Structure formats: structure tokens, C-alpha cells
Design a binder for this molecule. Structure first.
Ligand code: HEM
Ligand code: CMW
Length: 440
């Protein structure tokens, strides 16, 4: 019956939702600044209990779904999974099935080689010098890396830029209004639905083309119902493929962009990384060898990039019961959140938190490992990212190629590179123009 502390503002139609669209990080920081480790904001009808700091975060992260349910806490995903089911099982098991085969350790070497090949294909027409836009380049690249590694090379070879453009529109269909209802009649939700239909059509075209001529798609095409009719539709297959690719796409795209941006903004780190790559690859071993092993300067740059630019800025649960955190009572049904954007910059935990300091992660310091509940770009505890090893290998593979072949410079002011945080799926804003030139 007692209400939790509530952050200032929130006087718009849907409470704090309008501000959560326009400046979610400022809102979440204001919750912490005004209220401390436990505070709330209103997302339309829903109260969000935002936790921060090590103690409250530990509660959040160590909770299992019996206490804090993650399954229903990201409703923007519902229209993405859609209605089709290919492999019928419990929600939890269907989730395992999306990723686990491809994430097996024994598959990593092959993925690193695949990723290398995709990067070389993407830069094949670059020539001596030119300009790219980071969102256009990395969003497309990571469609190819994600499809080739998760679904198969044969399938990726039938994809082109159209798939990437449509997938982007799908990701843009994640407005926080989805906590109201992900099927509301707003333009971005409409464009999401149209884009999903376009992706189904691309897959149908691929399926039809193959009939007239044994990757995962071949297997699924061949499955017959009792009468001989094919068991699976293009919609069912497409829904599964879209869902298999989703977690790794926006995160790899953004993380690659921000890793390159931070390298360009910090040319001392960039120089150190180049030297390290040149020396390491001087043993003559392939990217499929090195991307699975230590590349310390690059890895520390990546860790610091993830600290400053975590691709998921808020993590969500639905409380399944009542809990007390620092004397504040969370009630059944409450949305409960933790924020990597805020936690990753707590000044007690990360000295000079707004500064890019890859040395934070060197062996004597290890600020990532020390701050178990507040260095959280991959989450922590029960639901810690199962894709982290893959994601880190992929950055190492991508930059092993890019940084040895080309030199990069910012074509716009360094301060002008920024994210669009208006959707639950964060994307780099445009323009993000960058010059390249072949290394001599
Ligand atoms: C830099 C890249 C990535 C980042 C920053 C990232 C971030 C995160 C975060 C913050 C969580 C915790 C979510 C929560 O607590 O609710 C998480 C969990 C998860 N991630 Fe990622 N992720 C990345 C790459 C990937 C990839 C490549 C995959 C699959 C190929 C993936 C699949 C998953 C899955 C399945 C979970 C849930 C694990 C569980 O519930 O036990 N992630 N990730
Ligand atoms: C397909 C899928 C992927 C991740 C999950 S989850 O249990 O982590 N729930 C979060 C759903 C929204 O995730 C999301 O929007 N992005 C994401 C990227 C990388 N890792 C995790 C999440 C659930 C389903």
C-alpha cells in the first residue's frame, strides 16, 4: 500500500514514457541521482522499479524466473517471434534451440573463419580509399555474419542488401509503447509488420528457387506432414530464422561500430592495437586461430567500449512475488529493471567513469572482474549472456581483418557519433561517416 519513491517529471500522457523514448539514459540517471539504489518511473500503465548499485543489482541478477521472470519482460519481441512454431517445446527450451547448437565451443573455429570470409567479401570493392557509413556497413556485415554462422553459408549466399534493410525496419519496431501493447496502431509498428512480411517473402522466394534445383533450410523444406504436404510454411521458417539472428545482430552491429569509433577517437589505443595485430599475425596463423585466443589490447578496447556503450541499456523482469530491497517493497506484477548504461558508469566502481581507459581491464586492475554486479554489458548471474564468447570472438575476427587491411579516420566531428535510443533496440544514429585508406 506504501508507494515506492518516484522520479521527478513524468507529467506527459504516458507518464515517463515520452522521456524514456527521447532520453532514457538521462531519465534512468535521474532516478539514481534523486532516489538512490531503488527508485521508480512510470511507463504508461506500468511502474518500473529501477535498481542500481552492487547490492540491488546482485538481487536482480541472482533471481531466477520463479522470483523475477525474464520470459514476459520484453514484449516488443512478441510480434517478432510471431505465431509460427517450428520445433514445439516449452518456452525455455525453444529459447535454448535458437542459439545453443551454433554457440558450441567446437563450432567457434569454423565461425571465426566464416566471419573472416564475410568481412573480406564486404570490403572486396573498397579499393584504395573511400568513405563508408558505419551503420550501413556494420548492419549489413552483421546480417551476413549472423546468417552464415547461425543458419548456414548456403543460406547467407542467397541474401543481399534487401534482407538487411528489412531486418533494420524490424528492429525499429521496438518502441517502448510495446510495454502498453506491441500491436498498437503506430507507424513504426506498422512498418515492423510490413518488414516482417517482406522477410517472409524473401525466404519464400529462396524456398521456391531451391525446389527447382543440405543446410538447415533444406532440412526444414524436406519435412513432410502425414499426407505428404510440406510440414512448414515460409512464415514458420522465417519466424525461426529471424528469431535465431536477433540477439546477435543489433549487438554485433553496434559493438563493432563503437569499437571502431573509440579506436578513432583514441589514436594511442588504435596504434597499440595495430602493433599488437601485426605482431600476433606475424606467426602466420589464421584468424580462425587468433580470434579464439588472447588479443589483449583489442580485447581491452572492446571491454571499455562495452562499458561506455552497452548495446542493451536496460534489462527487465516481472516480479512473481513480493520482495524487499533496502527496505523498499517490490510487489507481484511490478516491472523490475537494471541498467547497464547507468551501472557501468557508477563513479565509485569505475574511476573517471566517462573516460575511455582500456587499461582498466589489464591484469593488475581487472575492473570488469572486480565489479561483478555493476560491470554488466553482458548482464550477470542467472541470465548472463550465453553469446558473449561468440560476440567477443566475432569482434576479434572482424577487426583482425579490417585493421590489417585498412586505416580509418573520422569524416565528421568526433563528438557527432551517437546512438538513437528511442527504441528498445539501440541503433547507431546517422550520419556516421568514416574515411578509409589501404594500409601501406
Ligand atoms: C556484444 C554482444 C552482446 C551483448 C552486449 C549482449 C548482451 C546481453 C545481456 C545484457 C543479457 C542479459 C539479459 C537479461 O538479463 O535480461 C544477455 C543475455 C542473453 N544473450 Fe546476449 N548479448 C550479446 C550477444 C549475444 C549473442 C551473439 C547471442 C546469441 C548468438 C546472445 C544471446 C543471448 C541469450 C540467449 C541471453 C539469455 C541467457 C539466459 O537467459 O540465460 N547474445 N545478452
Ligand atoms: C531470441 C531471444 C534472445 C534473447 C532473449 S533474452 O532472454 O536475453 N531476453 C531479452 C529479449 C530482448 O533481447 C534483445 O533485445 N537483445 C538481446 C541481444 C543480445 N543478447 C540478449 C538480448 C530471448 C530471446
Amino acid at each position: 500500500a506504501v508507494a515506492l519513491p518516484r522520479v521527478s517529471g513524468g507529467h506527459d500522457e504516458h507518464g515517463h514514457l515520452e522521456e524514456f523514448r527521447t532520453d532514457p539514459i538521462g531519465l534512468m540517471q535521474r532516478v539514481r541521482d534523486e532516489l538512490g539504489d531503488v527508485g521508480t518511473f512510470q511507463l504508461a500503465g506500468k511502474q518500473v522499479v529501477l535498481l542500481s548499485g552492487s547490492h540491488a543489482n546482485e538481487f536482480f541478477f541472482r533471481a531466477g524466473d520463479d522470483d523475477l521472470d525474464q520470459a514476459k519482460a520484453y514484449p516488443f519481441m512478441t510480434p517478432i517471434f510471431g505465431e509460427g512454431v517450428v520445433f514445439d517445446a516449452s518456452p525455455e527450451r525453444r529459447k535454448e534451440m535458437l542459439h545453443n547448437a551454433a554457440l558450441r565451443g567446437e563450432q567457434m573455429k569454423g565461425h571465426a573463419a566464416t566471419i573472416e570470409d564475410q568481412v573480406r567479401r564486404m570490403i572486396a570493392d573498397w579499393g584504395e580509399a573511400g568513405e563508408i557509413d558505419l551503420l550501413d556497413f556494420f548492419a549489413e556485415l552483421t546480417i551476413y555474419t549472423s546468417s552464415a554462422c547461425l543458419i548456414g553459408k548456403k543460406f547467407r549466399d542467397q541474401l543481399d542488401g534487401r534482407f538487411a534493410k528489412l531486418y533494420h525496419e524490424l528492429e525499429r519496431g521496438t518502441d517502448p509503447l510495446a510495454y502498453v501493447d506491441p500491436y498498437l496502431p503506430i507507424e513504426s509498428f506498422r512498418r515492423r509488420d510490413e518488414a516482417r512480411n517482406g522477410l517472409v517473402a524473401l525466404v519464400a522466394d529462396i524456398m521456391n528457387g531451391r525446389i527447382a534445383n543440405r543446410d538447415m533450410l533444406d532440412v526444414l523444406i524436406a519435412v513432410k506432414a502425414e499426407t505428404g504436404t510440406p510440414r512448414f510454411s515460409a512464415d514458420e521458417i522465417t519466424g525461426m530464422f529471424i528469431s535465431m539472428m536477433f540477439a546477435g545482430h543489433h549487438t554485433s552491429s553496434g559493438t563493432a561500430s563503437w569499437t571502431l569509433i573509440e579506436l578513432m577517437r583514441h589514436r594511442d589505443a588504435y596504434a597499440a592495437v595495430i602493433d599488437e595485430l601485426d605482431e600476433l599475425y606475424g606467426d602466420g596463423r589464421s584468424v580462425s586461430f587468433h580470434a579464439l585466443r588472447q588479443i589483449p589490447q583489442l580485447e581491452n578496447v572492446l571491454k571499455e567500449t562495452l562499458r561506455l556503450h552497452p548495446p542493451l541499456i536496460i534489462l527487465m523482469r516481472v516480479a512473481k512475488g513480493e520482495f524487499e530491497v533496502q527496505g523498499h517493497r517490490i510487489h507481484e506484477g511490478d516491472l523490475v529493471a537494471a541498467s547497464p548504461a547507468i551501472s557501468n558508469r557508477i563513479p565509485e566502481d569505475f574511476p573517471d567513469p566517462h573516460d575511455f581507459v582500456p587499461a582498466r581491464y589489464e591484469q593488475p586492475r581487472q575492473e570488469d572482474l572486480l565489479n561483478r554486479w555493476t560491470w554488466i554489458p553482458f548482464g550477470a548471474g542467472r541470465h548472463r549472456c550465453v553469446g558473449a564468447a561468440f560476440a567477443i570472438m566475432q569482434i576479434k575476427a572482424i577487426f583482425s581483418v579490417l585493421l590489417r587491411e585498412y586505416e580509418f579516420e573520422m569524416a565528421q566531428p568526433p563528438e557527432s557519433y551517437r546512438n538513437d535510443h528511442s527504441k528498445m533496440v539501440v541503433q547507431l544514429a546517422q550520419p556516421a561517416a568514416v574515411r578509409y585508406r589501404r594500409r601501406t
